[PDB]
Amino acid sequence: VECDFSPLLSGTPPQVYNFKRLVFTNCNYNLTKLLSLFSVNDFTCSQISPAAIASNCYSSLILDYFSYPLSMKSDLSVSSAGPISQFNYKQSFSNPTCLILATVPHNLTTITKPLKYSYINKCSRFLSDDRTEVPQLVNANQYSPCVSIVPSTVWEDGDYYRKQLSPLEGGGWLVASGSTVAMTEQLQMGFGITVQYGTDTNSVCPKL
Ligand SMILES: *[C@@H]1O[C@H](CO)[C@@H](O)[C@H](O)[C@H]1NC(C)=O
Ligand SMILES: *[C@@H]1O[C@H](CO)[C@@H](O)[C@H](O)[C@H]1NC(C)=O
Numbered sequence: 182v183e184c185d186f187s188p189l190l191s192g193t194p195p196q197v198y199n200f201k202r203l204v205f206t207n208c209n210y211n212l213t214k215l216l217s218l219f220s221v222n223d224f225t226c227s228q229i230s231p232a233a234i235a236s237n238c239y240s241s242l243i244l245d246y247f248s249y250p251l252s253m254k255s256d257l258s259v260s261s262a263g264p265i266s267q268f269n270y271k272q273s274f275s276n277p278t279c280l281i282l283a284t285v286p287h288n289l290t291t292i293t294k295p296l297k298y299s300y301i302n303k304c305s306r307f308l309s310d311d312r313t314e315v316p317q318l319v320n321a322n323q324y325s326p327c328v329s330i331v332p333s334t335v336w337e338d339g340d341y342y343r344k345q346l347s348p349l350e351g352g353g354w355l356v357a358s359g360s361t362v363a364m365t366e367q368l369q370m371g372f373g374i375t376v377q378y379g380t381d382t383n384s385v386c387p388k389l
Pocket of ligand 2: 211
């Protein structure tokens with residue numbers, strides 16, 4: 182009857198384009214209890230507040246978490262053309278959402294570091310003319326089209342990934358490039374929260 186955030190605290194977190202997603206229904210949560218394990222560097226919301234998201238009742242609550250460098254903050258903003266919002270991670274524009282940037286302290290030994298930070302810097306599609314390039318932007322609540330060809334961790338910065346599509350998928354080529362950022366002194370993470378408001382189904386409530 183309590184929301185289990187355990188898989189977030191055990192093992193190596195994934196990369197922004199392989200964000201691990203936890204779904205929560207019919208349970209109770211202590212959100213300030215979870216954030217206290219971390220040094221919270223950034224906390225921004227949309228159509229909700231950081232105070233409201235901790236003290237409200239939802240039909241459902243979605244939690245996305247990945248490894249993400251604090252340096253790359255502006256790339257998460259939909260205002261920017263940054264490769265993260267375009268090709269890696271996008272939260273729903275319809276529902277209330279929250280994005281949290283935090284650092285995992287040395288005490289939290291159960292969370293292990295990746296070798297580095299990885300992200301997709303370009304993901305596009307070449308039309309049959311083989312001259313025109315159509316960017317393949319990531320949709321809300323979905324992974325990127327290029328996740329199938331981009332590895333869990335990019336081996337070297339500037340690596341290219343291509344795939345010849347079948348007429349089923351439309352023909353043409355699928356192109357992706359990878360980029361790396363050097364691992365920080367302390368692992369930095371990104372947490373994306375999405376909540377749904379129902380009518381008679383608001384089962385997810387704060388632990389009191
Ligand atoms: C545990 O965290 C505290 C900060 O709350 C820190 O001062 C301490 O060094 C950590 N424990 C160890 C064994 O480093
Ligand atoms: C559980 O949530 C309450 C708010 O409802 C918070 O004040 C408290 O600190 C949380 N529990 C712990 C052990 O921190």
